[PDB]
Nucleic acid binder design. Structure first.
Ligand code: TTP
Ligand code: MN
Ligand code: NA
Ligand code: NA
Length: 327
DNA sequence: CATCTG
DNA sequence: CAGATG
């Protein structure tokens, strides 16, 4: 956790570069398991050879470790941080909608900066365009003091649309969190579940209301169950407007709300543990259900859930406030 | 995983 | 449809 930090760090830099700049998925993946296992390792790696002893640890990585340990740097690592092409790709990628793949093509055509992109706004698709337009807004975190206003917003509209809606703002917001990065709304309705063959309106009618009132500003992606978009809190009495915030709405069959709700509420760490325990208690949990584990090796059969309560219970645990859902 | 693109 | 993004 700090005993082999630098090693796991340079390791991740190296790994990440493989995938992003080069295409070395294998290589990339290599650096990863490596950084993974050295992270667990209980000692203070004093040498290459020592590391090597580890699985996932080959001759090449060991080489790297050695040089790093020996000299506070790494040449390859140094050379990579200089390289324009590499830095360019790391940057482009910052734009929502731009992935490494596209990051390469742009750079190859010479688009390396923001200006570059504006100049060639023609080459970008919608998401990408939006991504570019709200570059800055996009990177700003979200003060919960804002979140509450928004949550307040969304909730009132869904309500006015159909009283049977059930909306939940999951995320860190849900877990206390002073600020968040984006707004996750989980949605369900009684009229929608496992078997119930579809109902798009379900999602589209609200999306619509939200835009209606001008909360939703753009659309990144709009499928029949998940909607990716842009939104913003009405600027009061013009002098101080709000940054555009990224939002995500998503349909959930009533019979699988709380699992996802639970789930999405994170944090990863809270999840797994809850997950590992579910296991002991003779169960299973994933993003939509909690099944009773048979013994034959495994089994199934979606247990019925009416609240986040029903799930803890199940695993015979202490119902945890969302706030404390920490780790 | 679900959606967009081309 | 394969392949990209989030
Ligand atoms: C899991 C991790 C999160 O709890 C959730 C997925 O939502 P994300 O938006 O990926 O994460 P988040 O809500 O934790 O982050 P943010 O600070 O951006 O709001 O499921
Ligand atoms: Mn979020
Ligand atoms: Na991006
Ligand atoms: Na292939």
């Amino acid at each position: 956790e700090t005993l082999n930090g630098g090693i796991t760090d340079m390791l991740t830099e190296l790994a990440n570069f493989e995938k992003n700049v080069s295409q070395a998925i294998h290589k990339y993946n290599a650096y990863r398991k490596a950084a993974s296992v050295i992270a667990k390792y209980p000692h203070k790696i004093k040498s290459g050879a020592e590391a090597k002893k580890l699985p996932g640890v080959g001759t090449k990585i060991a080489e790297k470790i050695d040089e790093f340990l020996a000299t506070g740097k790494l040449r390859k690592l140094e050379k990579i941080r200089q390289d324009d092409t590499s830095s360019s790709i790391n940057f482009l990628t910052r734009v929502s909608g731009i992935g490494p793949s596209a990051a390469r093509k742009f750079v190859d055509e010479g688009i390396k900066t923001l200006e570059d992109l504006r100049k060639n706004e023609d080459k970008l698709n919608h998401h990408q365009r939006i991504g570019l337009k709200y570059f800055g807004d996009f990177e700003k975190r979200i003060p919960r003091e804002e979140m509450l206003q928004m949550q307040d917003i969304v909730l009132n509209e869904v309500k006015k649309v159909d009283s049977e809606y059930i909306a939940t703002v999951c995320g860190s917001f849900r877990r206390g969190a002073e600020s968040s990065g984006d707004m996750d709304v989980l949605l369900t309705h009684p009229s929608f579940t496992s078997e119930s063959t579809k109902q798009p309106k379900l999602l589209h009618q609200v999306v619509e209301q939200l835009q209606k009132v001008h909360f939703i500003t753009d659309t990144l992606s709009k499928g029949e169950t998940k909607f990716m978009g842009v939104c913003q809190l009405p600027s009061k009495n013009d002098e101080k407007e709000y940054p555009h915030r990224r939002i995500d709405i998503r349909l959930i069959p009533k019979d699988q709300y709380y699992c996802g709700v639970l789930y999405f509420t994170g944090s990863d760490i809270f999840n797994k543990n809850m997950r590992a325990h579910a296991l002991e208690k003779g169960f299973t949990i994933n993003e939509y259900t909690i099944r009773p584990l048979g013994v034959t090796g495994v089994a199934g059969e979606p247990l019925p859930v009416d609240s986040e309560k029903d799930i803890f219970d199940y695993i015979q645990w202490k119902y945890r406030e969302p706030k404390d859902r920490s780790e």
